[PDB]
Design a protein around this motif. Structure first.
Motif, PDB file in Angstrom:
ATOM      1  N   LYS A 259      22.730   4.489  24.818  1.00 29.14           N
ATOM      2  CA  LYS A 259      21.680   3.990  25.758  1.00 29.14           C
ATOM      3  C   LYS A 259      21.114   2.704  25.203  1.00 29.14           C
ATOM      4  CE  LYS A 259      17.070   5.102  27.398  1.00 29.14           C
ATOM      5  NZ  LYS A 259      16.138   6.185  27.804  1.00 29.14           N
ATOM      6  N   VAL A 260      20.985   1.693  26.059  1.00 36.08           N
ATOM      7  CA  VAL A 260      20.264   0.472  25.693  1.00 36.08           C
ATOM      8  C   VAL A 260      18.855   0.553  26.269  1.00 36.08           C
ATOM      9  CG1 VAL A 260      20.164  -2.050  25.760  1.00 36.08           C
ATOM     10  CG2 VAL A 260      22.413  -0.911  25.603  1.00 36.08           C
ATOM     11  N   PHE A 261      17.863   0.654  25.389  1.00 35.08           N
ATOM     12  CA  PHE A 261      16.464   0.746  25.819  1.00 35.08           C
ATOM     13  C   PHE A 261      15.946  -0.620  26.215  1.00 35.08           C
ATOM     14  CE2 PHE A 261      16.536   4.791  23.718  1.00 35.08           C
ATOM     15  CZ  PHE A 261      15.442   5.512  24.205  1.00 35.08           C
ATOM     16  N   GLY A 262      15.023  -0.636  27.174  1.00 35.15           N
ATOM     17  CA  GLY A 262      14.163  -1.797  27.353  1.00 35.15           C
ATOM     18  C   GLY A 262      13.142  -1.862  26.229  1.00 35.15           C
ATOM     19  N   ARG A 263      12.582  -3.049  26.015  1.00 36.49           N
ATOM     20  CA  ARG A 263      11.590  -3.274  24.967  1.00 36.49           C
ATOM     21  C   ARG A 263      10.403  -2.298  25.053  1.00 36.49           C
ATOM     22  NH1 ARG A 263       6.893  -6.373  24.808  1.00 36.49           N
ATOM     23  NH2 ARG A 263       7.386  -7.231  26.873  1.00 36.49           N
ATOM     24  N   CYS A 264       9.723  -2.283  26.197  1.00 33.33           N
ATOM     25  CA  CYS A 264       8.555  -1.416  26.367  1.00 33.33           C
ATOM     26  C   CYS A 264       8.920   0.066  26.452  1.00 33.33           C
ATOM     27  CB  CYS A 264       7.732  -1.837  27.589  1.00 33.33           C
ATOM     28  SG  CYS A 264       6.906  -3.439  27.414  1.00 33.33           S
ATOM     29  N   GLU A 265      10.092   0.342  27.016  1.00 31.37           N
ATOM     30  CA  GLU A 265      10.595   1.702  27.081  1.00 31.37           C
ATOM     31  C   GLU A 265      10.765   2.272  25.671  1.00 31.37           C
ATOM     32  OE1 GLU A 265      14.560   2.184  28.497  1.00 31.37           O
ATOM     33  OE2 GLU A 265      14.266   4.338  28.899  1.00 31.37           O
ATOM     34  N   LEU A 266      11.344   1.480  24.766  1.00 31.98           N
ATOM     35  CA  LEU A 266      11.487   1.926  23.383  1.00 31.98           C
ATOM     36  C   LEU A 266      10.149   2.042  22.653  1.00 31.98           C
ATOM     37  CD1 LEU A 266      13.385   2.858  21.133  1.00 31.98           C
ATOM     38  CD2 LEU A 266      13.647   0.434  20.511  1.00 31.98           C
ATOM     39  N   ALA A 267       9.247   1.085  22.874  1.00 35.53           N
ATOM     40  CA  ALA A 267       7.922   1.145  22.266  1.00 35.53           C
ATOM     41  C   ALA A 267       7.243   2.457  22.641  1.00 35.53           C
ATOM     42  CB  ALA A 267       7.067  -0.052  22.690  1.00 35.53           C
ATOM     43  N   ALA A 268       7.301   2.809  23.924  1.00 36.03           N
ATOM     44  CA  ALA A 268       6.710   4.059  24.394  1.00 36.03           C
ATOM     45  C   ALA A 268       7.363   5.295  23.778  1.00 36.03           C
ATOM     46  CB  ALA A 268       6.763   4.133  25.917  1.00 36.03           C
ATOM     47  N   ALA A 269       8.691   5.306  23.726  1.00 43.98           N
ATOM     48  CA  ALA A 269       9.417   6.422  23.134  1.00 43.98           C
ATOM     49  C   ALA A 269       9.086   6.585  21.650  1.00 43.98           C
ATOM     50  CB  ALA A 269      10.903   6.239  23.328  1.00 43.98           C
ATOM     51  N   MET A 270       9.019   5.458  20.937  1.00 49.19           N
ATOM     52  CA  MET A 270       8.666   5.474  19.518  1.00 49.19           C
ATOM     53  C   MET A 270       7.245   5.985  19.291  1.00 49.19           C
ATOM     54  SD  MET A 270      10.363   2.024  18.031  1.00 49.19           S
ATOM     55  CE  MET A 270      11.933   2.081  17.160  1.00 49.19           C
ATOM     56  N   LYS A 271       6.318   5.590  20.169  1.00 49.83           N
ATOM     57  CA  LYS A 271       4.938   6.077  20.096  1.00 49.83           C
ATOM     58  C   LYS A 271       4.871   7.581  20.370  1.00 49.83           C
ATOM     59  CE  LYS A 271       0.196   5.235  21.615  1.00 49.83           C
ATOM     60  NZ  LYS A 271      -0.357   5.072  20.241  1.00 49.83           N
ATOM     61  N   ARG A 272       5.586   8.016  21.406  1.00 49.25           N
ATOM     62  CA  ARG A 272       5.719   9.439  21.741  1.00 49.25           C
ATOM     63  C   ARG A 272       6.176  10.262  20.529  1.00 49.25           C
ATOM     64  NH1 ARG A 272      10.179  13.119  24.190  1.00 49.25           N
ATOM     65  NH2 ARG A 272      11.773  11.512  23.697  1.00 49.25           N
ATOM     66  N   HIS A 273       7.129   9.714  19.771  1.00 44.33           N
ATOM     67  CA  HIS A 273       7.717  10.397  18.613  1.00 44.33           C
ATOM     68  C   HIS A 273       6.968  10.161  17.303  1.00 44.33           C
ATOM     69  CE1 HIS A 273      11.188  10.966  21.329  1.00 44.33           C
ATOM     70  NE2 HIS A 273      11.464  11.992  20.546  1.00 44.33           N
ATOM     71  N   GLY A 274       5.807   9.519  17.394  1.00 39.84           N
ATOM     72  CA  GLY A 274       4.882   9.402  16.267  1.00 39.84           C
ATOM     73  C   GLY A 274       5.117   8.283  15.269  1.00 39.84           C
ATOM     74  N   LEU A 275       5.814   7.229  15.678  1.00 43.15           N
ATOM     75  CA  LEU A 275       6.036   6.095  14.774  1.00 43.15           C
ATOM     76  C   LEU A 275       4.896   5.082  14.699  1.00 43.15           C
ATOM     77  CD1 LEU A 275       9.735   4.884  14.939  1.00 43.15           C
ATOM     78  CD2 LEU A 275       8.620   6.095  13.051  1.00 43.15           C
ATOM     79  N   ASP A 276       4.014   5.065  15.700  1.00 42.89           N
ATOM     80  CA  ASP A 276       2.928   4.087  15.713  1.00 42.89           C
ATOM     81  C   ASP A 276       2.005   4.326  14.531  1.00 42.89           C
ATOM     82  OD1 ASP A 276       1.200   1.977  16.332  1.00 42.89           O
ATOM     83  OD2 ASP A 276       0.383   2.914  18.141  1.00 42.89           O
ATOM     84  N   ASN A 277       1.957   3.327  13.661  1.00 43.20           N
ATOM     85  CA  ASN A 277       1.217   3.377  12.406  1.00 43.20           C
ATOM     86  C   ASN A 277       1.717   4.405  11.383  1.00 43.20           C
ATOM     87  OD1 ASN A 277      -2.247   3.118  11.353  1.00 43.20           O
ATOM     88  ND2 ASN A 277      -0.585   1.607  11.209  1.00 43.20           N
ATOM     89  N   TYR A 278       2.949   4.885  11.562  1.00 38.66           N
ATOM     90  CA  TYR A 278       3.540   5.776  10.573  1.00 38.66           C
ATOM     91  C   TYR A 278       3.692   5.031   9.235  1.00 38.66           C
ATOM     92  CZ  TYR A 278       6.140   9.593   8.518  1.00 38.66           C
ATOM     93  OH  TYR A 278       6.549  10.628   7.693  1.00 38.66           O
TER      94      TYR A 278
END
Length: 129
Positions: free
Chosen positions: A1-20
């Protein structure tokens, strides 16, 4: 799958990477951009015979099993193929282990060379998060 920029940002946030480990979401998106161009199916063969897999180009020398990297480890306890999934769970979970290893995001050479110290917030600018 090729993610869009914001689509990946959201998925990464969902999975707890934001400020990890203190790394803002933009760092993770920037790293994925230059590692894989947001393509979960990205692979790259290294000179030493190891292979990098997935959106964050995680290496078989230490982190996953591919059955063809002599002397290697599998510290994330996964087949490297799991890192190619449209579902980023395995890549994210393994990335959490890597970034906790001691050198933070410097483990990703492309992050050090292309993202570190830049305006990484630009990578999540405009995104609904």
């Amino acid at each position: 799958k090729v993610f869009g920029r914001c689509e990946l940002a959201a998925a990464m946030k969902r999975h707890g990477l934001d400020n990890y480990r203190g790394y803002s979401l933009g760092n993770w998106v920037c790293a994925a951009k230059f590692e894989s161009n947001f393509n979960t199916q990205a692979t790259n063969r290294n000179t030493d015979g190891s292979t990098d897999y997935g959106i964050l180009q995680i290496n078989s020398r230490w982190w996953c099993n591919d059955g063809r990297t002599p002397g290697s480890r599998n510290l994330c306890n996964i087949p490297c193929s799991a890192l190619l999934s449209s579902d980023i769970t395995a890549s994210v979970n393994c990335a959490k282990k890597i970034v906790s290893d001691g050198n933070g995001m410097n483990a990703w050479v492309a992050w050090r060379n292309r993202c570190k110290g830049t305006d990484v917030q630009a990578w999540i600018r405009g995104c609904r998060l």
